[PDB]
Amino acid sequence: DSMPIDWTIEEVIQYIESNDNSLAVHGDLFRKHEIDGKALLLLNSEMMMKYMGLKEGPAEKICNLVNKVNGRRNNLAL
Amino acid sequence: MPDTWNVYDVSQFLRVNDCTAHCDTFSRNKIDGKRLLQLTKDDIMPLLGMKVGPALKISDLIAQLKCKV
């Protein structure tokens, strides 16, 4: 319904949850780190696993989700 | 020229780029131009309460700063 970069934190969460129900658990994590649309597109696997404490699985799933909407920015990968 | 900037210079930079919220932490830690441009993400993380979103945003802003220069 909007450019990924214009997403609020809640709208980022909504994206991740509706595409992978297994990631709903990480809602509050995204809120703490204040990951809105701009922040989401700026993420990398490193920052996810080092500083957000996400495991390999989830991190990979999130990398994938960002890759679907981050346009021609470099694909996130482990 | 960012390398000339003092602590006040950094605050204003943060201000006009919609990062007003972080000026006081930056001041308290005496982040002037020189230190600014030296900052890594590992450094930026505790300066913003270990929050990734803001950390990345600030890292990006500095990187952009370094571009036209």
mmCIF file of N, CA and C in Angstrom:
data_model
loop_
_atom_site.group_PDB
_atom_site.id
_atom_site.type_symbol
_atom_site.label_atom_id
_atom_site.label_comp_id
_atom_site.label_asym_id
_atom_site.label_seq_id
_atom_site.Cartn_x
_atom_site.Cartn_y
_atom_site.Cartn_z
ATOM 1 N N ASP A 1 0.819 -1.207 0.000
ATOM 2 C CA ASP A 1 0.000 0.000 0.000
ATOM 3 C C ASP A 1 0.856 1.261 0.000
ATOM 4 N N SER A 2 2.157 1.058 -0.042
ATOM 5 C CA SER A 2 3.104 2.128 0.036
ATOM 6 C C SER A 2 4.576 1.711 -0.200
ATOM 7 N N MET A 3 5.411 2.703 -0.418
ATOM 8 C CA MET A 3 6.794 2.455 -0.634
ATOM 9 C C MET A 3 7.317 1.854 0.657
ATOM 10 N N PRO A 4 8.101 0.787 0.567
ATOM 11 C CA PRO A 4 8.710 0.176 1.751
ATOM 12 C C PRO A 4 9.463 1.180 2.617
ATOM 13 N N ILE A 5 10.059 2.190 1.994
ATOM 14 C CA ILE A 5 10.855 3.166 2.726
ATOM 15 C C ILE A 5 9.969 4.089 3.564
ATOM 16 N N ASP A 6 8.684 4.156 3.227
ATOM 17 C CA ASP A 6 7.741 5.006 3.951
ATOM 18 C C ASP A 6 7.010 4.249 5.060
ATOM 19 N N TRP A 7 7.390 2.994 5.283
ATOM 20 C CA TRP A 7 6.712 2.157 6.271
ATOM 21 C C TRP A 7 7.010 2.584 7.699
ATOM 22 N N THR A 8 5.985 2.533 8.543
ATOM 23 C CA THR A 8 6.163 2.706 9.977
ATOM 24 C C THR A 8 6.682 1.398 10.560
ATOM 25 N N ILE A 9 7.062 1.408 11.811
ATOM 26 C CA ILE A 9 7.485 0.191 12.469
ATOM 27 C C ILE A 9 6.384 -0.877 12.395
ATOM 28 N N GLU A 10 5.159 -0.500 12.724
ATOM 29 C CA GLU A 10 4.074 -1.467 12.738
ATOM 30 C C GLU A 10 3.863 -2.054 11.338
ATOM 31 N N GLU A 11 4.035 -1.224 10.316
ATOM 32 C CA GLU A 11 3.807 -1.665 8.944
ATOM 33 C C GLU A 11 4.907 -2.620 8.489
ATOM 34 N N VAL A 12 6.121 -2.417 8.993
ATOM 35 C CA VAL A 12 7.209 -3.362 8.763
ATOM 36 C C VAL A 12 6.843 -4.709 9.375
ATOM 37 N N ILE A 13 6.407 -4.723 10.622
ATOM 38 C CA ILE A 13 5.998 -5.917 11.323
ATOM 39 C C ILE A 13 4.893 -6.654 10.598
ATOM 40 N N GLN A 14 3.928 -5.917 10.105
ATOM 41 C CA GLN A 14 2.798 -6.425 9.370
ATOM 42 C C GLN A 14 3.308 -7.141 8.124
ATOM 43 N N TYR A 15 4.291 -6.567 7.469
ATOM 44 C CA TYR A 15 4.859 -7.169 6.268
ATOM 45 C C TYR A 15 5.469 -8.524 6.623
ATOM 46 N N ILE A 16 6.366 -8.520 7.585
ATOM 47 C CA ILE A 16 7.077 -9.718 7.958
ATOM 48 C C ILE A 16 6.111 -10.817 8.470
ATOM 49 N N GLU A 17 5.142 -10.454 9.296
ATOM 50 C CA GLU A 17 4.189 -11.434 9.813
ATOM 51 C C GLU A 17 3.302 -12.079 8.746
ATOM 52 N N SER A 18 2.770 -11.284 7.842
ATOM 53 C CA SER A 18 1.857 -11.765 6.789
ATOM 54 C C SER A 18 2.525 -12.584 5.681
ATOM 55 N N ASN A 19 3.840 -12.477 5.576
ATOM 56 C CA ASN A 19 4.566 -13.297 4.636
ATOM 57 C C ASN A 19 5.193 -14.529 5.269
ATOM 58 N N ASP A 20 5.539 -14.440 6.550
ATOM 59 C CA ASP A 20 6.019 -15.564 7.345
ATOM 60 C C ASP A 20 5.494 -15.488 8.786
ATOM 61 N N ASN A 21 4.536 -16.348 9.108
ATOM 62 C CA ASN A 21 3.922 -16.380 10.427
ATOM 63 C C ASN A 21 4.894 -16.785 11.496
ATOM 64 N N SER A 22 5.957 -17.469 11.097
ATOM 65 C CA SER A 22 6.993 -17.900 12.019
ATOM 66 C C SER A 22 7.817 -16.737 12.605
ATOM 67 N N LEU A 23 7.759 -15.581 11.967
ATOM 68 C CA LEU A 23 8.484 -14.407 12.424
ATOM 69 C C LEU A 23 7.677 -13.459 13.314
ATOM 70 N N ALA A 24 6.401 -13.756 13.548
ATOM 71 C CA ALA A 24 5.567 -12.885 14.380
ATOM 72 C C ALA A 24 6.151 -12.698 15.767
ATOM 73 N N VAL A 25 6.887 -13.688 16.207
ATOM 74 C CA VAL A 25 7.505 -13.654 17.525
ATOM 75 C C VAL A 25 8.420 -12.440 17.669
ATOM 76 N N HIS A 26 8.990 -11.998 16.551
ATOM 77 C CA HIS A 26 10.017 -10.962 16.567
ATOM 78 C C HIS A 26 9.441 -9.552 16.463
ATOM 79 N N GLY A 27 8.140 -9.421 16.699
ATOM 80 C CA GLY A 27 7.491 -8.122 16.704
ATOM 81 C C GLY A 27 8.161 -7.132 17.639
ATOM 82 N N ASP A 28 8.137 -7.430 18.935
ATOM 83 C CA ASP A 28 8.679 -6.525 19.946
ATOM 84 C C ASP A 28 10.158 -6.217 19.730
ATOM 85 N N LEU A 29 10.856 -7.112 19.082
ATOM 86 C CA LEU A 29 12.264 -6.928 18.798
ATOM 87 C C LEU A 29 12.439 -5.755 17.812
ATOM 88 N N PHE A 30 11.590 -5.722 16.806
ATOM 89 C CA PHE A 30 11.586 -4.677 15.802
ATOM 90 C C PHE A 30 11.187 -3.343 16.387
ATOM 91 N N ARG A 31 10.315 -3.376 17.384
ATOM 92 C CA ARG A 31 9.877 -2.178 18.058
ATOM 93 C C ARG A 31 11.012 -1.596 18.891
ATOM 94 N N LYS A 32 11.695 -2.445 19.649
ATOM 95 C CA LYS A 32 12.809 -1.988 20.478
ATOM 96 C C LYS A 32 13.870 -1.291 19.639
ATOM 97 N N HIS A 33 14.219 -1.902 18.512
ATOM 98 C CA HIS A 33 15.266 -1.398 17.633
ATOM 99 C C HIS A 33 14.762 -0.322 16.688
ATOM 100 N N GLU A 34 13.479 -0.046 16.807
ATOM 101 C CA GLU A 34 12.854 1.015 16.023
ATOM 102 C C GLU A 34 13.107 0.816 14.533
ATOM 103 N N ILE A 35 12.806 -0.386 14.056
ATOM 104 C CA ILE A 35 12.991 -0.716 12.653
ATOM 105 C C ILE A 35 11.747 -0.345 11.854
ATOM 106 N N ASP A 36 11.743 0.874 11.326
ATOM 107 C CA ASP A 36 10.723 1.297 10.380
ATOM 108 C C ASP A 36 11.175 0.924 8.970
ATOM 109 N N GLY A 37 10.504 1.474 7.963
ATOM 110 C CA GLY A 37 10.806 1.167 6.577
ATOM 111 C C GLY A 37 12.226 1.507 6.166
ATOM 112 N N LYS A 38 12.646 2.733 6.460
ATOM 113 C CA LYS A 38 13.995 3.186 6.143
ATOM 114 C C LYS A 38 15.042 2.308 6.819
ATOM 115 N N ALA A 39 14.817 1.997 8.091
ATOM 116 C CA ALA A 39 15.733 1.148 8.844
ATOM 117 C C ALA A 39 15.799 -0.258 8.247
ATOM 118 N N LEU A 40 14.643 -0.786 7.854
ATOM 119 C CA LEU A 40 14.559 -2.138 7.300
ATOM 120 C C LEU A 40 15.436 -2.279 6.061
ATOM 121 N N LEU A 41 15.310 -1.327 5.144
ATOM 122 C CA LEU A 41 16.067 -1.344 3.899
ATOM 123 C C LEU A 41 17.569 -1.168 4.130
ATOM 124 N N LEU A 42 17.933 -0.625 5.288
ATOM 125 C CA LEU A 42 19.336 -0.394 5.623
ATOM 126 C C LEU A 42 19.960 -1.582 6.353
ATOM 127 N N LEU A 43 19.138 -2.556 6.731
ATOM 128 C CA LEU A 43 19.629 -3.722 7.460
ATOM 129 C C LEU A 43 20.604 -4.560 6.641
ATOM 130 N N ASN A 44 21.356 -5.381 7.347
ATOM 131 C CA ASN A 44 22.208 -6.406 6.822
ATOM 132 C C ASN A 44 22.225 -7.556 7.797
ATOM 133 N N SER A 45 22.556 -8.729 7.320
ATOM 134 C CA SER A 45 22.601 -9.925 8.146
ATOM 135 C C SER A 45 23.490 -9.770 9.329
ATOM 136 N N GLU A 46 24.582 -9.066 9.179
ATOM 137 C CA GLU A 46 25.485 -8.808 10.266
ATOM 138 C C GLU A 46 24.830 -8.086 11.436
ATOM 139 N N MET A 47 24.197 -6.958 11.189
ATOM 140 C CA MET A 47 23.534 -6.163 12.223
ATOM 141 C C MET A 47 22.403 -6.952 12.879
ATOM 142 N N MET A 48 21.736 -7.789 12.090
ATOM 143 C CA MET A 48 20.648 -8.623 12.594
ATOM 144 C C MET A 48 21.128 -9.619 13.641
ATOM 145 N N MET A 49 22.170 -10.367 13.307
ATOM 146 C CA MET A 49 22.617 -11.452 14.166
ATOM 147 C C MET A 49 23.523 -10.954 15.287
ATOM 148 N N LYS A 50 24.275 -9.890 15.029
ATOM 149 C CA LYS A 50 25.170 -9.356 16.047
ATOM 150 C C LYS A 50 24.412 -8.558 17.105
ATOM 151 N N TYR A 51 23.561 -7.642 16.651
ATOM 152 C CA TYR A 51 22.967 -6.635 17.513
ATOM 153 C C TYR A 51 21.465 -6.782 17.808
ATOM 154 N N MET A 52 20.761 -7.579 17.024
ATOM 155 C CA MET A 52 19.344 -7.831 17.287
ATOM 156 C C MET A 52 19.151 -9.226 17.882
ATOM 157 N N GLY A 53 20.201 -10.041 17.838
ATOM 158 C CA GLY A 53 20.201 -11.333 18.500
ATOM 159 C C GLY A 53 19.398 -12.402 17.783
ATOM 160 N N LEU A 54 19.072 -12.150 16.521
ATOM 161 C CA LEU A 54 18.293 -13.094 15.730
ATOM 162 C C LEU A 54 19.141 -14.301 15.337
ATOM 163 N N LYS A 55 18.561 -15.483 15.352
ATOM 164 C CA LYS A 55 19.252 -16.714 14.947
ATOM 165 C C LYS A 55 19.406 -16.772 13.438
ATOM 166 N N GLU A 56 20.125 -17.760 12.962
ATOM 167 C CA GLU A 56 20.335 -17.928 11.551
ATOM 168 C C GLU A 56 19.054 -18.063 10.800
ATOM 169 N N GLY A 57 18.142 -18.892 11.258
ATOM 170 C CA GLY A 57 16.926 -19.123 10.554
ATOM 171 C C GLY A 57 16.156 -17.894 10.284
ATOM 172 N N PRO A 58 15.733 -17.245 11.353
ATOM 173 C CA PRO A 58 14.929 -16.026 11.248
ATOM 174 C C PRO A 58 15.648 -14.971 10.418
ATOM 175 N N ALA A 59 16.923 -14.768 10.708
ATOM 176 C CA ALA A 59 17.731 -13.775 10.008
ATOM 177 C C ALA A 59 17.680 -13.983 8.502
ATOM 178 N N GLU A 60 17.702 -15.238 8.089
ATOM 179 C CA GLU A 60 17.713 -15.576 6.705
ATOM 180 C C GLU A 60 16.393 -15.299 6.108
ATOM 181 N N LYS A 61 15.353 -15.670 6.811
ATOM 182 C CA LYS A 61 13.991 -15.390 6.389
ATOM 183 C C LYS A 61 13.757 -13.877 6.243
ATOM 184 N N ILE A 62 14.263 -13.098 7.191
ATOM 185 C CA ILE A 62 14.126 -11.642 7.149
ATOM 186 C C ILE A 62 14.925 -11.053 5.987
ATOM 187 N N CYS A 63 16.135 -11.563 5.772
ATOM 188 C CA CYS A 63 16.939 -11.138 4.632
ATOM 189 C C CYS A 63 16.164 -11.322 3.335
ATOM 190 N N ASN A 64 15.493 -12.464 3.231
ATOM 191 C CA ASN A 64 14.706 -12.774 2.066
ATOM 192 C C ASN A 64 13.559 -11.805 1.863
ATOM 193 N N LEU A 65 12.844 -11.523 2.920
ATOM 194 C CA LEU A 65 11.710 -10.618 2.879
ATOM 195 C C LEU A 65 12.146 -9.206 2.447
ATOM 196 N N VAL A 66 13.247 -8.738 2.983
ATOM 197 C CA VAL A 66 13.762 -7.420 2.620
ATOM 198 C C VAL A 66 14.144 -7.412 1.139
ATOM 199 N N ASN A 67 14.743 -8.499 0.688
ATOM 200 C CA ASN A 67 15.127 -8.638 -0.686
ATOM 201 C C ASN A 67 13.968 -8.527 -1.642
ATOM 202 N N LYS A 68 12.788 -8.967 -1.265
ATOM 203 C CA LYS A 68 11.625 -8.834 -2.110
ATOM 204 C C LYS A 68 11.181 -7.396 -2.392
ATOM 205 N N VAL A 69 11.508 -6.467 -1.519
ATOM 206 C CA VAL A 69 10.968 -5.107 -1.581
ATOM 207 C C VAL A 69 12.027 -3.999 -1.605
ATOM 208 N N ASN A 70 13.305 -4.362 -1.530
ATOM 209 C CA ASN A 70 14.360 -3.352 -1.454
ATOM 210 C C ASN A 70 14.888 -2.932 -2.830
ATOM 211 N N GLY A 71 14.165 -3.302 -3.884
ATOM 212 C CA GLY A 71 14.478 -2.848 -5.228
ATOM 213 C C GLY A 71 15.827 -3.312 -5.743
ATOM 214 N N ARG A 72 16.668 -2.355 -6.132
ATOM 215 C CA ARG A 72 17.988 -2.659 -6.682
ATOM 216 C C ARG A 72 19.103 -2.516 -5.652
ATOM 217 N N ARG A 73 18.751 -2.214 -4.410
ATOM 218 C CA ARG A 73 19.718 -2.313 -3.324
ATOM 219 C C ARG A 73 20.285 -3.753 -3.330
ATOM 220 N N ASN A 74 21.495 -3.922 -2.837
ATOM 221 C CA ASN A 74 22.112 -5.228 -2.761
ATOM 222 C C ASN A 74 21.290 -6.223 -1.940
ATOM 223 N N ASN A 75 21.139 -7.429 -2.462
ATOM 224 C CA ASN A 75 20.482 -8.496 -1.736
ATOM 225 C C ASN A 75 21.157 -8.792 -0.412
ATOM 226 N N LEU A 76 20.378 -8.834 0.659
ATOM 227 C CA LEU A 76 20.889 -9.241 1.959
ATOM 228 C C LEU A 76 21.141 -10.743 1.951
ATOM 229 N N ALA A 77 22.232 -11.136 2.529
ATOM 230 C CA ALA A 77 22.577 -12.508 2.602
ATOM 231 C C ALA A 77 23.569 -12.820 3.708
ATOM 232 N N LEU A 78 23.484 -14.048 4.164
ATOM 233 C CA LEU A 78 24.355 -14.574 5.184
ATOM 234 C C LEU A 78 25.675 -15.024 4.611
ATOM 235 N N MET B 1 33.458 22.050 6.308
ATOM 236 C CA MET B 1 34.249 20.858 6.162
ATOM 237 C C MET B 1 34.153 20.096 7.470
ATOM 238 N N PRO B 2 33.539 18.929 7.452
ATOM 239 C CA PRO B 2 33.336 18.208 8.684
ATOM 240 C C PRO B 2 34.514 18.048 9.580
ATOM 241 N N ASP B 3 35.711 17.942 9.046
ATOM 242 C CA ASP B 3 36.860 17.802 9.909
ATOM 243 C C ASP B 3 37.078 19.067 10.734
ATOM 244 N N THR B 4 36.534 20.190 10.325
ATOM 245 C CA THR B 4 36.626 21.413 11.135
ATOM 246 C C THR B 4 35.538 21.491 12.226
ATOM 247 N N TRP B 5 34.452 20.761 12.045
ATOM 248 C CA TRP B 5 33.307 20.870 12.942
ATOM 249 C C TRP B 5 33.608 20.591 14.434
ATOM 250 N N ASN B 6 33.056 21.405 15.321
ATOM 251 C CA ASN B 6 33.047 21.124 16.761
ATOM 252 C C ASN B 6 31.773 20.376 17.189
ATOM 253 N N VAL B 7 31.574 20.216 18.500
ATOM 254 C CA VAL B 7 30.454 19.489 19.052
ATOM 255 C C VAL B 7 29.142 20.144 18.636
ATOM 256 N N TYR B 8 29.116 21.466 18.668
ATOM 257 C CA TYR B 8 27.958 22.226 18.219
ATOM 258 C C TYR B 8 27.703 22.034 16.741
ATOM 259 N N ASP B 9 28.752 21.944 15.956
ATOM 260 C CA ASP B 9 28.592 21.728 14.529
ATOM 261 C C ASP B 9 27.852 20.365 14.293
ATOM 262 N N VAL B 10 28.236 19.335 15.030
ATOM 263 C CA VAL B 10 27.644 18.004 14.908
ATOM 264 C C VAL B 10 26.159 18.025 15.314
ATOM 265 N N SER B 11 25.830 18.808 16.322
ATOM 266 C CA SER B 11 24.453 18.889 16.799
ATOM 267 C C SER B 11 23.532 19.462 15.727
ATOM 268 N N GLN B 12 23.982 20.486 15.074
ATOM 269 C CA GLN B 12 23.200 21.118 14.078
ATOM 270 C C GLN B 12 23.072 20.223 12.890
ATOM 271 N N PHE B 13 24.098 19.472 12.606
ATOM 272 C CA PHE B 13 24.050 18.576 11.453
ATOM 273 C C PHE B 13 22.963 17.549 11.713
ATOM 274 N N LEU B 14 23.010 16.977 12.880
ATOM 275 C CA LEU B 14 21.998 16.028 13.314
ATOM 276 C C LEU B 14 20.608 16.666 13.305
ATOM 277 N N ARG B 15 20.522 17.947 13.623
ATOM 278 C CA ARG B 15 19.236 18.629 13.668
ATOM 279 C C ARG B 15 18.554 18.738 12.319
ATOM 280 N N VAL B 16 19.273 19.231 11.332
ATOM 281 C CA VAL B 16 18.661 19.535 10.044
ATOM 282 C C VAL B 16 18.401 18.267 9.234
ATOM 283 N N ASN B 17 18.947 17.144 9.695
ATOM 284 C CA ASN B 17 18.735 15.856 9.038
ATOM 285 C C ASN B 17 17.767 14.981 9.829
ATOM 286 N N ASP B 18 16.899 15.632 10.598
ATOM 287 C CA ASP B 18 15.843 14.957 11.350
ATOM 288 C C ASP B 18 16.382 13.921 12.335
ATOM 289 N N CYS B 19 17.502 14.240 12.978
ATOM 290 C CA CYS B 19 18.061 13.390 14.027
ATOM 291 C C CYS B 19 18.224 14.187 15.318
ATOM 292 N N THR B 20 17.367 15.172 15.482
ATOM 293 C CA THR B 20 17.351 16.003 16.661
ATOM 294 C C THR B 20 17.421 15.211 17.923
ATOM 295 N N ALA B 21 16.822 14.046 17.952
ATOM 296 C CA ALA B 21 16.745 13.253 19.167
ATOM 297 C C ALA B 21 18.068 12.775 19.730
ATOM 298 N N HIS B 22 19.089 12.720 18.906
ATOM 299 C CA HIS B 22 20.366 12.199 19.312
ATOM 300 C C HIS B 22 21.462 13.250 19.634
ATOM 301 N N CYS B 23 21.128 14.502 19.449
ATOM 302 C CA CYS B 23 22.086 15.557 19.675
ATOM 303 C C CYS B 23 22.673 15.544 21.076
ATOM 304 N N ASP B 24 21.846 15.396 22.082
ATOM 305 C CA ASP B 24 22.312 15.507 23.448
ATOM 306 C C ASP B 24 23.293 14.388 23.831
ATOM 307 N N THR B 25 23.038 13.165 23.376
ATOM 308 C CA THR B 25 23.981 12.066 23.607
ATOM 309 C C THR B 25 25.319 12.325 22.912
ATOM 310 N N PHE B 26 25.211 12.858 21.726
ATOM 311 C CA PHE B 26 26.356 13.162 20.934
ATOM 312 C C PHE B 26 27.213 14.259 21.629
ATOM 313 N N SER B 27 26.550 15.268 22.170
ATOM 314 C CA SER B 27 27.185 16.361 22.926
ATOM 315 C C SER B 27 27.810 15.914 24.191
ATOM 316 N N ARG B 28 27.088 15.103 24.919
ATOM 317 C CA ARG B 28 27.578 14.620 26.177
ATOM 318 C C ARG B 28 28.827 13.840 25.955
ATOM 319 N N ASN B 29 28.878 13.058 24.902
ATOM 320 C CA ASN B 29 30.072 12.328 24.585
ATOM 321 C C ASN B 29 31.096 13.082 23.759
ATOM 322 N N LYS B 30 30.856 14.350 23.588
ATOM 323 C CA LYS B 30 31.773 15.173 22.887
ATOM 324 C C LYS B 30 32.189 14.582 21.575
ATOM 325 N N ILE B 31 31.198 14.469 20.718
ATOM 326 C CA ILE B 31 31.378 14.030 19.362
ATOM 327 C C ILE B 31 31.408 15.284 18.487
ATOM 328 N N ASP B 32 32.613 15.687 18.129
ATOM 329 C CA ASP B 32 32.868 16.745 17.170
ATOM 330 C C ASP B 32 33.089 16.142 15.780
ATOM 331 N N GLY B 33 33.298 16.998 14.791
ATOM 332 C CA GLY B 33 33.518 16.560 13.430
ATOM 333 C C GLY B 33 34.507 15.412 13.306
ATOM 334 N N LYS B 34 35.706 15.607 13.833
ATOM 335 C CA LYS B 34 36.770 14.635 13.718
ATOM 336 C C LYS B 34 36.347 13.268 14.206
ATOM 337 N N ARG B 35 35.788 13.210 15.398
ATOM 338 C CA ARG B 35 35.331 11.967 15.944
ATOM 339 C C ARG B 35 34.149 11.439 15.155
ATOM 340 N N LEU B 36 33.325 12.313 14.659
ATOM 341 C CA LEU B 36 32.197 11.912 13.869
ATOM 342 C C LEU B 36 32.611 10.976 12.740
ATOM 343 N N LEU B 37 33.457 11.509 11.892
ATOM 344 C CA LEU B 37 33.963 10.817 10.732
ATOM 345 C C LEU B 37 34.778 9.588 11.036
ATOM 346 N N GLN B 38 35.081 9.341 12.290
ATOM 347 C CA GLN B 38 35.845 8.200 12.706
ATOM 348 C C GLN B 38 34.949 7.104 13.139
ATOM 349 N N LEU B 39 33.758 7.457 13.554
ATOM 350 C CA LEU B 39 32.808 6.509 14.063
ATOM 351 C C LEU B 39 32.511 5.264 13.208
ATOM 352 N N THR B 40 32.569 4.080 13.802
ATOM 353 C CA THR B 40 32.078 2.857 13.180
ATOM 354 C C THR B 40 30.676 2.591 13.709
ATOM 355 N N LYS B 41 30.018 1.567 13.180
ATOM 356 C CA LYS B 41 28.712 1.177 13.691
ATOM 357 C C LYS B 41 28.849 0.651 15.116
ATOM 358 N N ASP B 42 29.899 -0.128 15.361
ATOM 359 C CA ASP B 42 30.175 -0.660 16.693
ATOM 360 C C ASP B 42 30.230 0.464 17.728
ATOM 361 N N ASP B 43 30.717 1.627 17.303
ATOM 362 C CA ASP B 43 30.791 2.805 18.162
ATOM 363 C C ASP B 43 29.427 3.480 18.283
ATOM 364 N N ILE B 44 28.709 3.522 17.168
ATOM 365 C CA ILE B 44 27.427 4.210 17.090
ATOM 366 C C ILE B 44 26.340 3.488 17.889
ATOM 367 N N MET B 45 26.516 2.186 18.061
ATOM 368 C CA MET B 45 25.500 1.353 18.698
ATOM 369 C C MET B 45 25.231 1.800 20.149
ATOM 370 N N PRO B 46 26.251 1.862 20.998
ATOM 371 C CA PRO B 46 26.015 2.322 22.373
ATOM 372 C C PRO B 46 25.667 3.809 22.468
ATOM 373 N N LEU B 47 26.037 4.630 21.503
ATOM 374 C CA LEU B 47 25.695 6.035 21.511
ATOM 375 C C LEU B 47 24.239 6.230 21.253
ATOM 376 N N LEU B 48 23.551 5.201 20.807
ATOM 377 C CA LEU B 48 22.119 5.289 20.540
ATOM 378 C C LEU B 48 21.339 4.204 21.276
ATOM 379 N N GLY B 49 21.844 3.804 22.439
ATOM 380 C CA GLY B 49 21.136 2.878 23.306
ATOM 381 C C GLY B 49 21.003 1.483 22.728
ATOM 382 N N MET B 50 22.002 1.067 21.962
ATOM 383 C CA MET B 50 22.036 -0.256 21.383
ATOM 384 C C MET B 50 20.825 -0.512 20.478
ATOM 385 N N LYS B 51 20.350 0.519 19.814
ATOM 386 C CA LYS B 51 19.232 0.404 18.880
ATOM 387 C C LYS B 51 19.732 0.399 17.438
ATOM 388 N N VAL B 52 19.448 -0.680 16.729
ATOM 389 C CA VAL B 52 19.934 -0.882 15.375
ATOM 390 C C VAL B 52 19.371 0.127 14.363
ATOM 391 N N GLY B 53 18.070 0.355 14.418
ATOM 392 C CA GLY B 53 17.412 1.246 13.476
ATOM 393 C C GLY B 53 18.061 2.617 13.413
ATOM 394 N N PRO B 54 18.075 3.333 14.546
ATOM 395 C CA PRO B 54 18.751 4.632 14.655
ATOM 396 C C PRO B 54 20.236 4.553 14.299
ATOM 397 N N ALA B 55 20.901 3.501 14.766
ATOM 398 C CA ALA B 55 22.320 3.289 14.489
ATOM 399 C C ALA B 55 22.606 3.243 12.992
ATOM 400 N N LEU B 56 21.788 2.520 12.269
ATOM 401 C CA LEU B 56 21.947 2.398 10.853
ATOM 402 C C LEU B 56 21.654 3.706 10.131
ATOM 403 N N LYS B 57 20.671 4.408 10.616
ATOM 404 C CA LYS B 57 20.273 5.658 10.047
ATOM 405 C C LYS B 57 21.372 6.695 10.187
ATOM 406 N N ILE B 58 21.993 6.742 11.347
ATOM 407 C CA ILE B 58 23.102 7.651 11.619
ATOM 408 C C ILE B 58 24.336 7.252 10.814
ATOM 409 N N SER B 59 24.621 5.953 10.746
ATOM 410 C CA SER B 59 25.745 5.473 9.946
ATOM 411 C C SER B 59 25.569 5.900 8.492
ATOM 412 N N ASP B 60 24.348 5.752 7.985
ATOM 413 C CA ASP B 60 24.033 6.114 6.607
ATOM 414 C C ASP B 60 24.215 7.608 6.374
ATOM 415 N N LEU B 61 23.734 8.403 7.322
ATOM 416 C CA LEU B 61 23.827 9.853 7.234
ATOM 417 C C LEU B 61 25.284 10.315 7.181
ATOM 418 N N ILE B 62 26.134 9.727 7.996
ATOM 419 C CA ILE B 62 27.551 10.066 8.030
ATOM 420 C C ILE B 62 28.221 9.673 6.676
ATOM 421 N N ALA B 63 27.897 8.466 6.212
ATOM 422 C CA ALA B 63 28.387 7.969 4.950
ATOM 423 C C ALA B 63 28.013 8.946 3.853
ATOM 424 N N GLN B 64 26.788 9.439 3.877
ATOM 425 C CA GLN B 64 26.326 10.388 2.883
ATOM 426 C C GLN B 64 27.077 11.704 3.035
ATOM 427 N N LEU B 65 27.414 12.026 4.265
ATOM 428 C CA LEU B 65 28.114 13.222 4.540
ATOM 429 C C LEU B 65 29.444 13.142 3.848
ATOM 430 N N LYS B 66 30.116 12.041 4.058
ATOM 431 C CA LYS B 66 31.411 11.781 3.498
ATOM 432 C C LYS B 66 31.462 11.791 1.989
ATOM 433 N N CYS B 67 30.339 11.568 1.350
ATOM 434 C CA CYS B 67 30.253 11.626 -0.088
ATOM 435 C C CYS B 67 30.554 12.967 -0.714
ATOM 436 N N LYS B 68 29.725 13.978 -0.491
ATOM 437 C CA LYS B 68 30.022 15.275 -1.058
ATOM 438 C C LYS B 68 30.950 15.966 -0.099
ATOM 439 N N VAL B 69 32.211 16.039 -0.448
ATOM 440 C CA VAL B 69 33.231 16.434 0.479
ATOM 441 C C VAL B 69 34.624 16.385 -0.157
#
